[PDB]
Design a protein around this ligand. Sequence first.
Ligand SMILES: *C/C=C(C)/C=C/C=C(C)/C=C/C1=C(C)CCCC1(C)C
Lengths: 133, 133
Amino acid sequence: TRDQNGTWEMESNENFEGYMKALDIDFATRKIAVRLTQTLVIDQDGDNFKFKTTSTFRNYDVDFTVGVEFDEYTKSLDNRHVKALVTWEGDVLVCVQKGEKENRGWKKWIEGDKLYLELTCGDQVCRQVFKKK
Amino acid sequence: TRDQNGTWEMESNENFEGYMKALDIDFATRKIAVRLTQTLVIDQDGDNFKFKTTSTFRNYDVDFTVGVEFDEYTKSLDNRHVKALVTWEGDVLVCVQKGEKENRGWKKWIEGDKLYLELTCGDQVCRQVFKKK
Ligand SMILES: *C/C=C(C)/C=C/C=C(C)/C=C/C1=C(C)CCCC1(C)C
């Protein structure tokens, strides 16, 4: 049984922090790492191996069409049910989420090879910039 | 352009902490969140959108051939340089990482339909079990 190909999902984890302390990994990093799950992807072809380990905190998917108001559940983020309306205003993707939180939504657009995201809630605006891999 | 298709990886994130307290998220989740990185895949069909978001703490990618020494820089973990060599011991894949840490390496093998991983460094053994997806 030398074939280890596949996508492996962690089931159990013994003495993880003690091992990280042996590596002298700082306390704050250890306390975040002990929470998350782990997925190991192994691509094996003869004697040539490739591993990739991902930490992952939370996943988040959503599908919609512009102009169609739809009831959405903010999976993993805060687990709230909201009515969402994504519309165009020029070539900026603007969404307003109706619910128990004041002034909630986001704005998306592209300039060059960069995605520009602005999330708003209350008087807090979070500005993120993405690069295309 | 209104076309936002592609995989995007976050490169900068501002006021994410303030935006999150606006959503009444506990400070334990906030400390985990402000240090991850987000991968967003956008599937677009004119006006029908589909977003897939992944937040990730750290990644550990390796590629090697069994039986040939390879230099490794453990950025993402403890940031050390080691001389790694991977061999088979029957059905057990054995790796030795020669460097500053004593007895540093790991062992990986298939048992039943599960993958077993034992990470060693000095006196500490981290044991992990994986199921196949
Ligand atoms: C053959 C399998 C190997 C070498 C698996 C290695 C994975 C680790 C040593 C895990 C490392 C992690 C941390 C120390 C903290 C957070 C990030 C991880 C999951 C990559």
